[PDB]
């Protein structure tokens, strides 16, 4: 295994280093506004060395943006694909590339058999070529790597089954900035090439000047280079025709033949395209070839890529004709005029890459190596696209919830083969597809119109329900005596109880377990642990009585804590935000211990009085002018007092101190250690009254954030043996700090209400001497080193925080893990900040046509880990990566993949079993079974189950960390006949494993295995 910590990779271009050296000056470079006047030697190409030009027709189809997926399909896409089929069929030399499989599948299944065959033929013959082949072209900033893989697999599995093809070239022309997580996954999925477009204009200029636009992109920790994937970065401002033929859009626009008038399009540079004729072809060709040769100067081979397309292009038959005919005339002339020394033709993306590598093998070009990412993107001036790291945070959080539900549903149902009547495969396909669709760069990004966001939400809600159905049916089968099991595949044996989604104060969705002497004495509950190691976690349920005790199935008492059910309300009368307690519902909390990838059953029983093994939390309401707070049957009376500083400690965990405003002030790790200053503060960013305004994409603050006026907020302190908390009702945010014995959990119920042109940020202030360095993760896969650059505006220093961020000095580190992707930064030494929500009244001129005024309450969750790191073996000062500690990694897992809770619906569960998976191996803490999916339906003689195994890299800080079993996923199911290593999509077999044993992977590696069972 490669050492991902101590060996700094030697690469030609390291993005953090490049950023440190670049000046980012935004000067007018001429016709190529952000470049320079390209010059070339006409004698460079000749009869013995011609410029090969591939014009690649394409159509960018957004699976939702200003219209819903279905609206675009009906109005545009079905026509684009229908006419593509006809035109390609009738013109053998014409070519076309397609990226969005969600749309292609929607189209293909509606086609008659005759047309399906014609479609398969033009794909088989190479006229229509799929690029990437994912369900969508995903966002690369907010997306979790697990979902990027999910959507890629969804699209490619469909392509293999119906088109009999698997793309090895990727096309990503629209994500707002690019992540190395893409080549990571792609390279492990059979890919050999990839193309990107939206990178900072300064970066394009810098790399263009050194002809480093094509490079071998390797991971930041990869010293050997085995993760490298050839990457092509487009050099200009856009992927549209005016910015893809050469450096001068005024000239290139004249070669977009759809802009002559009848199509309602024109050229903003004032010179319209002109139909090619024998009379003007010589002059037209001279202009075009000149542009091509200028573009060619920016690359190293004699093979040039010229994309020909735009948003939803090639829709009308007349459009296909106008583009094809005019280009055909240009090709005939150019290719017949030796003085040009050019051979141009329509081509596909793969054809371009094949030619490039042929030139490379011929030894005419050597490519540079590169590591790093391409955030934060700016398309012009100071317009940095960091706003979408936070836009529509409700759905960003929903993404992570559904991500987990999909994993749990696929895993729980994978243990058995199901009869078709159970509709398991049907529900799982629906769930995977709705989640996959949301990975779109206008989905999770929060950059779609309001009604489109609603469509995505509805789709995900249906996916969540599908997931619940599959999960509960699976639990019933896994924990019921075989000879008693009698399933009704439409019946709900269990109801899922989720305490953090939609969340308290967001939607009263979770059910109350109703117990009573005259109705029902007890209730069975079951917890699922999707992680491959034994796990303990506190779980809570709402019960109709405070006198409830918990037992495991062996009837062993389990220590429990009962607390009130508190809800915060914006009192319109008193003009205050205060909590009200329920007098009929209560929260029971207890520690559940669940097997690796298993289930554990517990029983809740009511009694007439306080049970021996259940304790009750004390409650203290701090504020002036308090009023009574009755809690019905709740044992202890609420206490009151004027606001004051408080200190709390649960178990042997840390001791936290809070200000009289209910905000964290310090953390004391041990009784001996000191009180380390760690202050939570909420501030607000505004919008500029002059110039460019912030919108769904852009973050254009009117200066540093201003503190939110808190006044004298109401603070609620709940102290219990198992769980304690401090909650405060601040303007726009009910902030909560929860303690359960380890790193605290932070929950923010964010309701920005009607505060227009405001962005609410949560900041942490410490004494950590971090300087200008901080770390943020990329797609929940890796942590990359960031350097605050004062030479860039505030918004440029904001980065995606898909799952976590941290700052550190020689001795201390503070890590904030998130349960949702949001934007964040470290604007000063010792600080960490992350945006909660943003409400913007104006549009930011990127085509959305609206601001962001559809905010809704969202419950954001986090874990805050303060640690001493002076003893940890960390990367050298020059290493571009960072790594989490065991505690921080586990805290992240507690947020993204918590235990699942099921409540038995009926009064009695006959044949109930107390546990499943007690014999499953408990794998090393850094290893995870990211995916477990049965790949075959019940009718298959040989069943196949696929697994995606990921091993992260945790810092070694002197902790023994022992007793763990080797995890062989191929033997998790009985009767294994063969074990194979496959691409991450499970589509290609890479190795036949001897002994049918799937070996564990190396740190930072991800592998896929498929076990076959007779
Ligand atoms: C799929 O493509 C492969 C190309 O290697 C070919 O051998 C095979 O016959 C094709 N199968 C079909 C008909 O889908
Ligand atoms: Zn797009």
Curated annotation (Swiss-Prot):
<dbReference type="GO" id="GO:0006486">
    <property type="term" value="P:protein glycosylation"/>
</dbReference>
<dbReference type="InterPro" id="IPR011330">
    <property type="entry name" value="Glyco_hydro/deAcase_b/a-brl"/>
</dbReference>
<dbReference type="InterPro" id="IPR037094">
    <property type="entry name" value="Glyco_hydro_38_cen_sf"/>
</dbReference>
<keyword id="KW-0862">Zinc</keyword>
<keyword id="KW-0812">Transmembrane</keyword>
<dbReference type="InterPro" id="IPR028995">
    <property type="entry name" value="Glyco_hydro_57/38_cen_sf"/>
</dbReference>
<dbReference type="InterPro" id="IPR013780">
    <property type="entry name" value="Glyco_hydro_b"/>
</dbReference>
<dbReference type="InterPro" id="IPR011682">
    <property type="entry name" value="Glyco_hydro_38_C"/>
</dbReference>
<dbReference type="InterPro" id="IPR011013">
    <property type="entry name" value="Gal_mutarotase_sf_dom"/>
</dbReference>
<dbReference type="Pfam" id="PF21260">
    <property type="entry name" value="Laman-like_dom"/>
</dbReference>
<dbReference type="InterPro" id="IPR041566">
    <property type="entry name" value="AManII_C"/>
</dbReference>
<dbReference type="Pfam" id="PF07748">
    <property type="entry name" value="Glyco_hydro_38C"/>
</dbReference>
<feature type="binding site">
    <location>
        <position position="174"/>
    </location>
    <ligand>
        <name>Zn(2+)</name>
    </ligand>
</feature>
<dbReference type="GO" id="GO:0004572">
    <property type="term" value="F:mannosyl-oligosaccharide 1,3-1,6-alpha-mannosidase activity"/>
</dbReference>
<feature type="binding site">
    <location>
        <position position="441"/>
    </location>
    <ligand>
        <name>Zn(2+)</name>
    </ligand>
</feature>
<keyword id="KW-0472">Membrane</keyword>
<feature type="binding site">
    <location>
        <position position="62"/>
    </location>
    <ligand>
        <name>Zn(2+)</name>
    </ligand>
</feature>
<protein>
    <recommendedName>
        <fullName>Alpha-mannosidase 2</fullName>
        <ecNumber>3.2.1.114</ecNumber>
    </recommendedName>
</protein>
<dbReference type="Pfam" id="PF01074">
    <property type="entry name" value="Glyco_hydro_38N"/>
</dbReference>
<dbReference type="GO" id="GO:0016063">
    <property type="term" value="P:rhodopsin biosynthetic process"/>
</dbReference>
<keyword id="KW-1133">Transmembrane helix</keyword>
<keyword id="KW-1015">Disulfide bond</keyword>
<comment type="pathway">
    <text>Protein modification; protein glycosylation.</text>
</comment>
<dbReference type="InterPro" id="IPR027291">
    <property type="entry name" value="Glyco_hydro_38_N_sf"/>
</dbReference>
<comment type="subunit">
    <text>Homodimer; disulfide-linked.</text>
</comment>
<keyword id="KW-0326">Glycosidase</keyword>
<dbReference type="InterPro" id="IPR000602">
    <property type="entry name" value="Glyco_hydro_38_N"/>
</dbReference>
<dbReference type="InterPro" id="IPR015341">
    <property type="entry name" value="Glyco_hydro_38_cen"/>
</dbReference>
<dbReference type="GO" id="GO:0006013">
    <property type="term" value="P:mannose metabolic process"/>
</dbReference>
<keyword id="KW-0479">Metal-binding</keyword>
<dbReference type="GO" id="GO:0004559">
    <property type="term" value="F:alpha-mannosidase activity"/>
</dbReference>
<dbReference type="GO" id="GO:0005783">
    <property type="term" value="C:endoplasmic reticulum"/>
</dbReference>
<dbReference type="GO" id="GO:0000139">
    <property type="term" value="C:Golgi membrane"/>
</dbReference>
<dbReference type="GO" id="GO:0030246">
    <property type="term" value="F:carbohydrate binding"/>
</dbReference>
<feature type="binding site">
    <location>
        <position position="60"/>
    </location>
    <ligand>
        <name>Zn(2+)</name>
    </ligand>
</feature>
<dbReference type="GO" id="GO:0015923">
    <property type="term" value="F:mannosidase activity"/>
</dbReference>
<dbReference type="GO" id="GO:0005795">
    <property type="term" value="C:Golgi stack"/>
</dbReference>
<dbReference type="GO" id="GO:0046872">
    <property type="term" value="F:metal ion binding"/>
</dbReference>
<keyword id="KW-0378">Hydrolase</keyword>
<feature type="topological domain" description="Lumenal">
    <location>
        <begin position="1"/>
        <end position="1014"/>
    </location>
</feature>
<comment type="similarity">
    <text>Belongs to the glycosyl hydrolase 38 family.</text>
</comment>
<dbReference type="InterPro" id="IPR048534">
    <property type="entry name" value="Man2a1-like_dom"/>
</dbReference>
């Amino acid at each position: 295994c490669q050492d991902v910590v101590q060996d700094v990779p030697n690469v030609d271009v390291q993005m953090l280093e490049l950023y440190d050296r670049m000046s980012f000056k935004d000067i007018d470079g001429g016709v190529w506004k952000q470049g320079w006047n390209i010059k070339y030697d006409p004698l460079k190409y000749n009869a013995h060395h011609k410029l090969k030009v591939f014009v690649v027709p394409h159509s960018h189809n957004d699976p939702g943006w200003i219209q819903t997926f279905e609206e675009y399909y009906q109005h545009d896409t079905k026509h684009i694909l229908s006419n593509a089929l006809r035109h390609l069929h009738d013109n053998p030399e014409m070519k076309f590339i397609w990226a969005e499989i969600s749309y292609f599948a929607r189209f293909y299944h509606d086609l008659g058999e005759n047309k399906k065959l014609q479609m398969k033929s033009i794909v088989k013959n190479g006229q229509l070529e799929f690029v990437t082949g994912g369900w969508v072209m995903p966002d690369e900033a907010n997306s979790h790597w697990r979902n990027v893989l999910l959507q890629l697999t969804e699209g490619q599995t469909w392509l293999k089954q119906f088109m009999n093809v698997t793309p090895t070239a990727s096309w990503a022309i629209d994500p707002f900035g690019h992540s190395p997580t893409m080549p990571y996954i792609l390279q492990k999925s059979g890919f050999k090439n990839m193309l990107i477009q939206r990178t900072h204009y300064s970066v394009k200029k810098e790399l263009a000047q050194q002809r480093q636009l094509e490079f071998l992109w390797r991971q930041i920790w990869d010293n050997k280079g085995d993760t490298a994937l050839f990457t092509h970065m487009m050099p200009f401002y856009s992927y549209d025709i005016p910015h893809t033929c050469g450096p001068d859009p005024k000239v290139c626009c004249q070669f977009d033949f759809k802009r002559m008038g009848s199509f309602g399009l024109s050229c903003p540079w004032k010179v319209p395209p002109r139909t090619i004729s024998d009379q003007n072809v010589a002059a037209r060709s001279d202009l075009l070839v000149d542009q091509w040769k200028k573009k060619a100067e920016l690359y190293r081979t004699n093979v040039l890529l010229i994309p020909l397309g735009d948003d939803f292009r090639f829709k009308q038959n007349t459009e296909w004709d106008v583009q094809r005919v005019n280009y055909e005339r240009l090709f005939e002339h150019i290719n017949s005029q030796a003085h040009f020394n050019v051979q141009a033709q329509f081509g596909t993306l793969q054809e371009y890459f094949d030619a490039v590598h042929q030139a490379e093998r011929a030894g005419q070009a050597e490519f540079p190596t590169l590591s790093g990412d391409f955030f934060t993107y700016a398309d012009r001036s100071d317009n940095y696209w960091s706003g979408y790291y936070t836009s529509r945070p409700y759905h960003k959080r929903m993404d992570r919830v559904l991500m987990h539900y999909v994993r749990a549903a696929e895993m729980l149902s994978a243990w058995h083969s199901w009869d078709g009547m159970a509709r398991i495969e049907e529900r799982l396909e629906q769930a995977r597809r709705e989640l996959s669709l949301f990975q779109h760069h206008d989905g999770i990004t929060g950059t779609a119109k309001t009604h489109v966001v609603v469509d995505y939400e509805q789709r995900m809600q249906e996916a969540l329900k599908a997931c619940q159905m599959v999960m509960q049916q699976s639990v019933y089968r896994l924990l019921t005596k075989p000879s008693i099991y009698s399933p009704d595949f439409s019946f709900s044996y269990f109801t899922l109880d989720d305490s953090r989604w939609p969340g308290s104060g967001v939607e009263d969705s979770r059910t109350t377990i109703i117990l009573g002497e005259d109705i029902l004495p007890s209730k069975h509950v079951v917890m699922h642990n999707t992680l491959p190691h034994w796990r303990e976690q506190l779980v809570d349920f709402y019960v109709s009585s405070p006198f409830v005790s918990v037992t495991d199935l062996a009837n062993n008492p389990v220590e429990a804590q009962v607390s009130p059910v508190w809800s915060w309300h914006h009192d319109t009368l008193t003009k205050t935000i205060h909590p009200q307690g329920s007098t009929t519902k209560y929260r029971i909390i207890f520690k559940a211990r669940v097997p690796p990838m298993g289930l554990a059953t517990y029983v809740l029983t009511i009694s007439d009085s306080k049970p021996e093994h259940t304790s009750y939390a004390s409650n203290l309401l701090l504020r002036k002018n308090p009023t009574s707070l009755p809690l019905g049957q709740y044992p202890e009376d609420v206490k009151f007092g004027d606001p004051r500083e408080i200190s709390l400690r649960v178990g042997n965990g840390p001791t936290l101190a809070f200000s009289e405003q209910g905000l964290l002030k310090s953390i004391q790790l041990t009784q001996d250690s000191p009180h380390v200053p760690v202050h939570f503060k909420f501030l607000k960013y505004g919008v500029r009254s002059h110039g460019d305004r912030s919108g769904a994409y852009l973050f254009l603050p009117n200066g540093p954030a201003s503190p939110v006026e808190l006044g004298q907020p109401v603070v609620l302190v709940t102290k219990g043996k198992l769980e304690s908390s401090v909650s405060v009702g601040l303007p726009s945010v009910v902030h909560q700090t929860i303690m359960r014995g380890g790193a605290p959990e932070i929950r923010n119920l964010v309701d920005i209400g009607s505060l227009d042109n405001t962005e609410i940020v949560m900041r942490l202030e410490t004494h950590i001497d971090s300087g200008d360095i901080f770390y943020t993760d990329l797609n929940g896969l890796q942590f990359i080193k960031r350097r605050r650059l004062d030479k860039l505006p505030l918004q440029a220093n904001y980065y995606p925080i898909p799952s976590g961020m941290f700052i550190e000095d020689a001795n201390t580190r503070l890590t904030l893990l998130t349960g949702q992707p949001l934007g964040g930064s470290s604007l000063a030494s010792g600080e960490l900040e992350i945006m909660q929500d943003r409400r913007l009244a104006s549009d930011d001129e990127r085509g959305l046509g609206q601001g962001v005024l559809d905010n809704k309450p969202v419950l954001h969750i986090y874990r805050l880990v303060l640690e001493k790191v002076n003893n940890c073996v960390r990367p050298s000062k020059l290493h571009p990566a960072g790594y989490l500690t065991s505690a921080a990694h586990k805290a992240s897992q507690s947020l993204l993949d918590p235990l699942d809770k099921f409540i038995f619906a009926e009064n009695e569960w006959i044949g109930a079993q107390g546990q499943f998976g007690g014999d499953h191996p408990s794998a090393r803490e850094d290893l995870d079974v990211s995916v477990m999916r049965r790949l075959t339906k019940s009718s298959a003689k040989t069943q196949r189950v696929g697994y995606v195994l990921h091993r992260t890299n945790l810092m070694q800080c002197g902790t023994p960390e022992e007793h763990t079993q080797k995890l062989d996923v191929c033997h998790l199911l009985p009767n294994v006949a063969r074990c194979e290593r496959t691409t991450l999509t499970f589509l290609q077999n890479l190795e036949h494993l001897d002994g049918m044993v799937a070996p564990e992977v190396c740190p930072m590696e991800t592998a896929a295995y498929v076990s076959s069972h007779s």
